[PDB]
Structures are given as structure tokens and as C-alpha cells.
Amino acid sequence: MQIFVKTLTGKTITLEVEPSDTIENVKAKIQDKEGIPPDQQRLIFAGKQLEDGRTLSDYNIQKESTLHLVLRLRGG
Amino acid sequence: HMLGLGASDFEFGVDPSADPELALALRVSMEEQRQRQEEEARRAAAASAAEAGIATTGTEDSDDALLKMTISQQEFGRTGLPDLSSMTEEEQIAYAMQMSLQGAEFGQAESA
């Protein structure tokens, strides 16, 4: 399943993932494509933040879905 | 299990004033849903108004009868010639009104 991810810079990345893939695996995929650490990557959709322990399908995320990626800073 | 209670700490302990990255990310996702809820809300307004609105009957008791009875007295009147001696003021009116209601473009246009 291919999906799009828009970052705070209006940049949209198209990656290939599955519905059973967890948000943690999706963050690692964005890192290999750009180079950002998965620990600082945040996936937010429909106004709700996705949990690394949850899978894309759990958030009704289907192909062509556009997720929002944010850069988490060091805050405790 | 613990005394951390992580429930209303993200929607109050930090709020959007703690990070515009979280307030902007939720403002872009909520906006995309509204544009879809409306475009989808009205999309059904036309799918239900056309199926459960115009797709219904009304009051057509003699629909073809008006088409046959009217063309029955007008067709039998005219055949191999414009028989007007038999057409009354209404029978002739049906013939004069039939050729006048075919397309009244103007009626007054010869010299200028």
C-alpha cells in the first residue's frame, strides 16, 4: 500500500507500506528516505496522533492516505 | 497501575501554546476532514434528492388520453387537405394554434 506523508515544510513523501505495518515501521521508512531519526518523528492523522504500537489499518489508514509528520524535540 | 495518569496531560498540560507543531498538525488534519464532510455531505444531498425527490409520480390520470384525444380530433380533421369548412372556431383554433406554437421567433420582421 503506497501512502503520502506531509511534513511541516509542505514536503510530501510517497512510501510503500502495508496496512499491518506499525507506525514505528513507517517512521523508520521515512528516515531511510530523508534521514531523520525515528525517535524525533511523529505521525499525526485526522487530528489524532498515531501510536508506534498501532498499525496503519488500526487508524483506518488506506492507500493514498496523507499523514502528517512532525519533528519531536528533546523534552524530557 | 501508576500515578502518572496520561490522559488530559496532552490536551491541557501543554495545549497548542506549548508547540505550534502540534496545533498546526491538528489544524491541517481537521480542515481536510471538514472539506470532505461538506463535499460528501452535499454529494448525498443530490443522490437522495434525485432518487427520493424527482423519481416519483404525481397526478397523471389521462396523460396519453390527452395526447390521443387531442390528436384524435386534430388528426382526423386534417388529412389530404386543410379541411377548414368542417373545423369550428376551436377545431380551426387547434390548427392555427398548432402552427403558431411551433416556434414564435418574432412575427414582426419584414422591412427592417
UniProtKB/Swiss-Prot annotation, chain A:
<comment type="function">
    <text>Exists either covalently attached to another protein, or free (unanchored). When covalently bound, it is conjugated to target proteins via an isopeptide bond either as a monomer (monoubiquitin), a polymer linked via different Lys residues of the ubiquitin (polyubiquitin chains) or a linear polymer linked via the initiator Met of the ubiquitin (linear polyubiquitin chains).</text>
</comment>
<feature type="domain" description="Ubiquitin-like">
    <location>
        <begin position="1"/>
        <end position="76"/>
    </location>
</feature>
<feature type="site" description="Essential for function">
    <location>
        <position position="68"/>
    </location>
</feature>
<feature type="modified residue" description="(Microbial infection) ADP-ribosylthreonine">
    <location>
        <position position="66"/>
    </location>
</feature>
<feature type="cross-link" description="Glycyl lysine isopeptide (Lys-Gly) (interchain with G-Cter in ubiquitin)">
    <location>
        <position position="11"/>
    </location>
</feature>
<feature type="cross-link" description="Glycyl lysine isopeptide (Lys-Gly) (interchain with G-Cter in ubiquitin)">
    <location>
        <position position="6"/>
    </location>
</feature>
<feature type="cross-link" description="Glycyl lysine isopeptide (Lys-Gly) (interchain with G-Cter in ubiquitin)">
    <location>
        <position position="27"/>
    </location>
</feature>
<protein>
    <recommendedName>
        <fullName>Ubiquitin</fullName>
    </recommendedName>
</protein>
<feature type="cross-link" description="Glycyl lysine isopeptide (Lys-Gly) (interchain with G-Cter in ubiquitin)">
    <location>
        <position position="29"/>
    </location>
</feature>
<feature type="site" description="Interacts with activating enzyme">
    <location>
        <position position="72"/>
    </location>
</feature>
<feature type="site" description="Interacts with activating enzyme">
    <location>
        <position position="54"/>
    </location>
</feature>
<feature type="cross-link" description="Glycyl lysine isopeptide (Lys-Gly) (interchain with G-Cter in ubiquitin)">
    <location>
        <position position="63"/>
    </location>
</feature>
<feature type="cross-link" description="Glycyl lysine isopeptide (Gly-Lys) (interchain with K-? in acceptor proteins)">
    <location>
        <position position="76"/>
    </location>
</feature>
<feature type="cross-link" description="Glycyl lysine isopeptide (Lys-Gly) (interchain with G-Cter in ubiquitin)">
    <location>
        <position position="48"/>
    </location>
</feature>
<feature type="modified residue" description="Phosphoserine; by PINK1">
    <location>
        <position position="65"/>
    </location>
</feature>
<feature type="modified residue" description="ADP-ribosylglycine">
    <location>
        <position position="76"/>
    </location>
</feature>
<feature type="cross-link" description="Glycyl lysine isopeptide (Lys-Gly) (interchain with G-Cter in ubiquitin)">
    <location>
        <position position="33"/>
    </location>
</feature>
UniProtKB/Swiss-Prot annotation, chain B:
<feature type="compositionally biased region" description="Basic and acidic residues">
    <location>
        <begin position="30"/>
        <end position="43"/>
    </location>
</feature>
<feature type="region of interest" description="Disordered">
    <location>
        <begin position="30"/>
        <end position="61"/>
    </location>
</feature>
<feature type="region of interest" description="Interaction with UBQLN1">
    <location>
        <begin position="3"/>
        <end position="68"/>
    </location>
</feature>
<feature type="region of interest" description="Essential for ubiquitin-binding">
    <location>
        <begin position="93"/>
        <end position="97"/>
    </location>
</feature>
<feature type="modified residue" description="Phosphothreonine">
    <location>
        <position position="59"/>
    </location>
</feature>
<feature type="domain" description="UIM 2">
    <location>
        <begin position="88"/>
        <end position="107"/>
    </location>
</feature>
<comment type="function">
    <text>Component of the 26S proteasome, a multiprotein complex involved in the ATP-dependent degradation of ubiquitinated proteins. This complex plays a key role in the maintenance of protein homeostasis by removing misfolded or damaged proteins, which could impair cellular functions, and by removing proteins whose functions are no longer required. Therefore, the proteasome participates in numerous cellular processes, including cell cycle progression, apoptosis, or DNA damage repair.</text>
</comment>
<protein>
    <recommendedName>
        <fullName>26S proteasome non-ATPase regulatory subunit 4</fullName>
    </recommendedName>
</protein>
<comment type="similarity">
    <text>Belongs to the proteasome subunit S5A family.</text>
</comment>
<comment type="subunit">
    <text>Component of the 19S proteasome regulatory particle complex. The 26S proteasome consists of a 20S core particle (CP) and two 19S regulatory subunits (RP). The regulatory particle is made of a lid composed of 9 subunits, a base containing 6 ATPases and few additional components including PSMD4. Interacts with NUB1. Interacts with SQSTM1. Interacts with UBQLN4. Interacts with UBE3A. Interacts with UBQLN1 (via ubiquitin-like domain). Interacts with DDI2.</text>
</comment>
<feature type="modified residue" description="Phosphothreonine">
    <location>
        <position position="56"/>
    </location>
</feature>
<feature type="modified residue" description="Phosphoserine">
    <location>
        <position position="62"/>
    </location>
</feature>
<feature type="region of interest" description="Essential for ubiquitin-binding">
    <location>
        <begin position="22"/>
        <end position="26"/>
    </location>
</feature>
<feature type="modified residue" description="Phosphoserine">
    <location>
        <position position="72"/>
    </location>
</feature>
<feature type="domain" description="UIM 1">
    <location>
        <begin position="17"/>
        <end position="36"/>
    </location>
</feature>
